[PDB]
Structures are given as C-alpha cells and as structure tokens.
Design a binder for this molecule. Structure first.
Ligand code: HEC
Ligand code: HEC
Ligand SMILES: O=S([O-])[O-]
Length: 227
C-alpha cells in the first residue's frame, strides 16, 4: 500500500479546476442543501466519509477518498460488471442518500470527481492507500441487541437521540446524523450491513469489539426507508 496524504488547500490551483474542487468539497459536505433534487434523506456524504479541517473523505478507516480515483473502474458484484467512479457515486446517492443518481456528465458530479482527484494527487494509479474503506468487524456470535440498547443509551444517545433521529445544527444541517427512521440511510446502503456498521462504529468514529458488534445490532433492528 501507499500512505494516506492530504494535499494543502493553499496549493489549490487558480482557474477552472481549482474552482471545481472547491464546489466539489461543498457538494460532499452539504449534500442535501446543495443537491435537493438528488437527496432523499438528511445525510451528506461527510456523515460516513468524514474529514478534518473542512475536508471530506480524509480519515483512515472511514472510507477516505484519498486514492479512490485510481481504483476505478472496478468490478461490482451488485452490477455484475465493471463500473466507473461516477456510477459508484450514483449508487451512494440512491442508497446512502435515499435519493437519485446524478447524470454521469452532471457538473456537480464532475466537481465531486475533481475534488476526489485532488485528494488523490500523487497516488499511483492502481495503488491501494493505507486506511482505505471501512474495515468490517465480524464476531463469531449473534449481536446481542439487548446489550446493544444499553450501550446505545450510555454511549450514543446523547448525540444521535433516543429515537435515532440525530441533532440538527442552527442552519438545519445535521450536526449528529440520524441512525434510523425516515431521514437515515435506506436498506440498500452498505451501512445497513451488520459487519460494516460494526466496523464503522468501532473504527470510523473507546468501544471494545464486542460492544461495537452489539450496538450495531441494536441500531440495525430499527426501521428505515426501503430501497
Ligand atoms: C450512510 C453512510 C454513507 C453515506 C452517507 C455515504 N457513503 Fe459512500 N460509502 C459508505 C460505505 C460503508 C462504503 C464502503 C467502504 C468500503 O468499500 O469499505 C462507501 C464507499 C464509497 C465509495 C467507494 C470507496 C472505495 O474505496 O472504493 C465512494 C466513491 C463513496 N462511498 C462516495 C460517497 C459519496 C459521493 C456520498 C455522498 C453522495 C457517499 N458516499 C455517502 C457509506 C456511506
Ligand atoms: C460526540 C457525538 C457522537 C457520539 C457520542 C456518537 N456519534 Fe456517531 N456520529 C457522530 C457524527 C458527528 C457523525 C458524522 C461523521 C463524523 O463526522 O464523524 C457520526 C456518524 C455515525 C454513523 C454514520 C452516519 C449515519 O447517520 O448513520 C453511525 C452509524 C454512527 N455515528 C453510530 C454511532 C453509534 C452506534 C454511537 C455510540 C457507540 C455513536 N455513533 C456515538 C457523532 C457522535
Ligand atoms: O452504495 S451504498 O450507499 O450502498
């Protein structure tokens, strides 16, 4: 693998590419407000792809976008064939954002691509960046949702709410995003899978493995939009 590096925003180029990169960051950080026709819930991309200093997708083990562009096109079992990064992003809109995919030449999609390409600067095409994806966490026993409920009340509820509905900020964006219910990710999302949610809870955002497994189980007992 190669190291995860974040380029300097002060070294962003003047001109069309630089402006596109800045717009892409905003689309990724503020998606429901910037792309209402395509987003069907309360989530922005940064809610599962966080980053420090205003950037999105820069955190190891929380599915960073650093180096993503050089890994596409790639096989998708879901599609049964190779897909492009544009198509992957469309799947995220449809599932994680309970919405509608952008056209593959939509200027907002191209701005998102430009941003991801900027984050990927210097990464060799084909190389895997250390900390890519969300590592799954799988235990050799059933997730105990009863224990999970107790853990949730003690460790998560203060942010994500008794009803999993999250906490809005003053500008109507989610400070702490919804974990279930109508404004959360739909059943088609990767985060709706036990081992992915457990891995995200464990590494993506301390908890023991057993605690992460059980609380993920509790979270996933709840209703959310059907895909
Ligand atoms: C509810 C959580 C969630 C939200 C919201 C979300 N994603 Fe994802 N995304 C994931 C998970 C989980 C993966 C799988 C990571 C892995 O491959 O290990 C993923 C993978 C990706 C990948 C592929 C990463 C790789 O290394 O191959 C891209 C690109 C991506 N997401 C873009 C987006 C964009 C753009 C948005 C906003 C439109 C978005 N995602 C919103 C959870 C989310
Ligand atoms: C200090 C407040 C805080 C606490 C406590 C917290 N979270 Fe989060 N959570 C966040 C924020 C903020 C995000 C958006 C991603 C980011 O910036 O880290 C997030 C993202 C998530 C996501 C992905 C986004 C979504 O809407 O589904 C899941 C799943 C999640 N948290 C589950 C939990 C669980 C389970 C616990 C308890 C073990 C927990 N969180 C404790 C603030 C919190
Ligand atoms: O593509 S993900 O959002 O399931």
């Amino acid at each position: 693998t190669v190291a995860l590096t974040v380029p300097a925003a002060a070294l962003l180029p003047d001109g069309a590419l630089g402006e596109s990169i800045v717009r892409g960051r905003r689309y990724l950080s503020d998606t429901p407000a910037q792309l209402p026709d395509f987003v069907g819930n309360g989530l922005a991309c940064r809610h599962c792809h966080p980053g420090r200093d205003g950037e999105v997708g820069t955190e190891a083990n929380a599915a960073p976008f650093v180096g993503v562009v050089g890994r596409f096109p790639q096989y998708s079992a879901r599609h049964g064939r190779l897909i492009t990064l544009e198509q992957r992003i469309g799947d995220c809109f449809e599932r994680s954002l309970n919405g509608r995919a952008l056209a593959l030449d939509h200027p907002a999609l191209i701005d998102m691509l430009a941003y991801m390409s900027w984050l990927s600067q210097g990464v060799p095409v084909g190389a895997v960046v250390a900390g890519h994806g969300i590592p799954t966490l799988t235990l050799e026993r059933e997730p105990d949702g009863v224990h999970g409920e107790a853990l949730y009340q003690a460790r998560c509820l203060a942010c994500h709410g008794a009803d999993g509905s999250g906490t809005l900020d003053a500008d109507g964006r989610y400070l702490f995003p919804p974990l279930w219910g109508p404004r959360s990710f739909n059943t088609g999302a990767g985060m709706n899978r036990q081992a992915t949610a457990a891995g995200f809870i464990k590494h993506g955002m301390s908890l023991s493995d057993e605690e992460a497994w059980d609380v993920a189980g509790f979270v996933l007992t709840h209703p959310r939009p059907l895909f």
